[PDB]
Symmetry: D3
Subunit: 244 residues, 6 copies
């Protein structure tokens, strides 16, 4: 399989114009997309560890959820230097599907919507992120589900009592900034995401929004793992995981 083969498959599943404004998705590093690919590695972050592990395990196509750089640079030293050296020396391709993999059909968010069997889900945000629907069940049933498949000990901000069949909002990753709490407060009863700060915790309690912090890692990995199966089940490649 050529590099371009894989990239085409991915991009058909997670088209690039799904990506929110400014998101650095697609080819991060690479000079030849005709190159044949023996091993594909999959990670959350293109960290220095992941890059080294990739080269050690002989990965020649490195796919990561996060991009190598959010903000552009024009000077190459420190960590970024090291990351680039390895990738280029070993001719490893780094390719990224960030928000487009979150937003796409059956993507990271839909995976959470599907997990909780959300009735009539809709996107949560103006930019396509997150899903929101009714959870046909009790709050504790929802809690169990979170504990069983997402993250075993989630911090809960019980801001209000929660009736059966409540509106569940889910966002894979970092979804618990203040602006996001305030926004989702209009649209839901419970908000399942990751990275609750004290300020945001107070805010949630003030507006009556029930937050469950399953952390950014766990919600991402859950979707990413199913993307691995999808990758595995549809491609001949040896595919391994480096972050999970």
């Amino acid at each position: 399989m050529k590099a371009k083969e894989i990239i085409e498959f991915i991009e058909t599943f997670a088209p690039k114009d799904l990506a929110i404004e400014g998101d650095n998705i697609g080819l991060q590093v690479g000079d030849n997309l005709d190159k044949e690919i023996k091993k594909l590695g999959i990670a959350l972050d293109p960290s220095l560890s992941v890059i080294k592990k990739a080269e050690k395990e002989g990965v020649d196509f490195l796919f990561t959820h996060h991009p190598l750089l959010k903000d552009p640079i024009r000077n190459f030293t420190g960590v970024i230097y090291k990351k680039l050296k390895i990738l280029m020396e070993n001719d490893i391709i780094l390719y990224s599907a960030h928000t487009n993999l979150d937003i796409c059909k059956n993507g990271l968010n839909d995976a959470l919507a599907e997990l909780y069997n959300l009735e009539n889900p809709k996107p949560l945000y103006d930019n396509g992120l997150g899903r929101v629907g009714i959870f046909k069940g009790s709050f504790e049933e929802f809690l169990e589900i979170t504990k069983k498949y997402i993250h075993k000990n989630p911090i809960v901000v019980k801001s209000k009592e929660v009736d059966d069949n409540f509106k569940l909002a889910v966002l894979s990753g970092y979804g618990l900034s203040q602006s996001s709490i305030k926004y989702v407060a209009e649209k839901a009863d419970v908000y399942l995401s990751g990275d609750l700060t004290h300020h945001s915790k107070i805010l949630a309690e003030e507006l009556g929004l029930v937050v469950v912090d399953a952390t950014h890692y766990s919600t991402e990995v859950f979707g990413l793992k199913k993307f691995k199966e999808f990758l595995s089940s549809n491609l001949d490649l040896e595919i391994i995981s480096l972050d999970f």
Copy 2:
């Protein structure tokens, strides 16, 4: 019946303050507002054709939905020369009611809402455009109405199954732009508008918003026809459609 009176009647049906920020509504071309109006001509667009047919039919007050120019200019050459030429040579007044007609009670958007008999309809966008409510029927009957009343073969992106009594958003004109689509996907099961783009279609299929494109023309001309009947009913003068 003077021109200013006709203007006052229309401005009473659709007040100018209803217009979205920026819209160029009102007196487009014209100097003598006391001038007695003999034949009123109504068209969707003040194209070079319409402005010629106005000259041919002795139209001396020309109403359009679309304004003459979106963006100002300070040089007069090309088509716009020709347009202003035919208009000032024959002292034909040109007047437009644009998004104010899209937004007012029983305007172009209400026209659509009324046609599908939307249960508890409400404005779709923050600026007052579009309507959204429950369609008390099958997706099928919605299709039937659309075909029967608006456009005979709409392109349809059946992004997922549509259960009976679905939420239908409607927008007359060019409503199928990427920004629109993601926003409407939060609020509706089915979106009826015109002018689907490739990028727009993909967002829709991915987000699960079923989209129905019946062109900017067909969706606008429906409400515009009702507007003509409305003018003919309340105003004693001949009114021709130059455009439908």
Copy 3:
């Protein structure tokens, strides 16, 4: 009770970061928060009257809902001079909790929501302001409550008939601007707030949104009285109202 204790007590109830962007909340005028406080006066507005009255009453901590200044200055002349001269000459502390008091749990907006016993209420705006939920009753029952507890002769714009159990939006203060109304029109059947312009009236009529103008004063002062009681029930302090 020291100044800084009262402030802590107020800020624990109405956390500052709740405030909307740009809001001038907190300490308005003061130098020694360690000082001792005998008499706390509470007002809507830090008007010249309120400040004049404050001093003659021996109020040494003056709380207001509105900040002393929305827009900053670098010159001290006329009215603002006269206000500061008093506050300073008498070392009277001036401190506001504005939209943070509008937004917090059991704040000015939650008060109204509870007055009307809204069913499953949620915030109205992206920034925490307003509450919206179902009013389990008839429109008439709803007006009688408005008349009894808020303002005896509210102006009503009956743009549409209102069925029982309608969706009711409430916004304490100045919530009846053209942009506000366009927005709430998407989300409510009836909008209860204060201060209607003629354009806002017409716009509400075109969109189908029934507006009840109960004045900005009446909708704010209802909640402040609740806040005053709460303060009285919690502080061993003399608290008087300068404004109501």
Copy 4:
């Protein structure tokens, strides 16, 4: 002789790209450039008076220094309706050379310099406007050369004692701006231009710049006449002034 060739010729004398930023130079109103021209009028501005006179005289190419519209418009009524009316019914072409004609070799600004017999003259402003140099002579011969050839009675601000052989900056048209004074005060002893607000006057005195206000009309038409003579001489077809 055709329109384009007249234009081709004028752009020869004054290249369009010489013009300052955002200055509206070139074709103002015109349909067709293969139109054989008969009479060519010129004037400073395309006022209504100039434009009626141009039609009256059967002028079919109207050259103006000042362009028709500075800032652009998308509505056509009032004075601009009238102007655009006359030019289009009588197929009259309107062309402008504004700052390019102020700037080019032997432009209106060189004209003031050439006439004033200046020592080693150079551009006065960053954008190519004005000329500055030494006047071999006295103040008095200078006032005289002005009264006789420019404006028979100028207003003099005698900020400073002026000595023979001085720095004389000249600027054709409006150039007594409060900031044009501040700047020209660095770079000359005497400023010669047009239209002195009492503010500009007081400033120039305060800084020691000697200003001589010969109005905008006088100093602009001086150059224009030469351009007129430069025009009639080098081309066959007849050429009148409509403004001087």
Copy 5:
């Protein structure tokens, strides 16, 4: 005499509209422009120290060169609280002439350009600040003038030889920022101003501009001193200085 006349006098020498863009000139803290004035004070800076001294000396009109605030504020605490409390308890008026006093004839910049008898002294910057002219002498003479009148031990940055009869630029106050140094370097050989940052020194050595740091206090208080006398020689007023 009365406050509003003192102010009318100061604005007779120094128009407020002479001051550069955005400068906070005029009344700083004042309510009663018809207050009879007994004891005028002049200071460079309205520090808390000066303001205390004004109340202790019984000053009832405080004139400073620098404004009380450059940036507008809407809260009042700490230092500004203190300055205001004293200025308002004692009803002391604070008025300021800033760059208007720097720019006027015989202002703070002309003061320097006369100490050094500069020949043909012109404005330095585009905003009217500063004076530049040929110094009819030797660098040595220049520097001895500087040490006697302005400031005794000025830091000199001299990277090359100043000839005789050179371009001297003077700026009262702070004129030794980087970008100004780059700019005076195209226009003078020597540059007398205040406050040299290290980065600025380096820049001056590199570009060949000879810089004399005379402190900002000294280069200002020189011309302030001509003022205090000019003011004393024209008013029946007790006039004392609180900063010199």
Copy 6:
């Protein structure tokens, strides 16, 4: 010789804070600055050719005048990928002094001022770039000094005839863009720089400035050669040239 010592040397000569706003100077690609340097290579440009010759001729420190990237990037493919690879497999350090090397004492502009022996030469622009001064000589003398040392067959725009002892302006590199041409024409009789656009030609002609285009290669390489010898004189290690 450690890399940091080499760097600290260059920066002593041409300090970093000398560079114009936004100029990407300093370390460009490099991990280890303690690295020992056996062979320094210098070039005008970090072109792909140059980076290859550096690897070929065993260069372990590459100094360039021009930076590797002016505009930031966050994707690594194509040319930039190739440049980066060679520098990072081979651990070659890329470093640059750009406008700081044009602006520093005895930098690239001074070198030209040196070569033409300009009388009391000063910075041309506000940013520190360029040099202007009296050329105590004849024009044909100037031409010969130019043909001999800079570039053999200059392209010359003789717009006006030149007196001996004229003002000469030099700018190492790209300096013949229309905006520059207008500025310089205020300040100089002849302007010597590189890369003359046809639109810049006419502008100079019409403005009456003499322009001598000796390409940007030659004008920069002249002072680059002097800088190279300077390094040699003061430093061990072999210093080769890669562009000249």
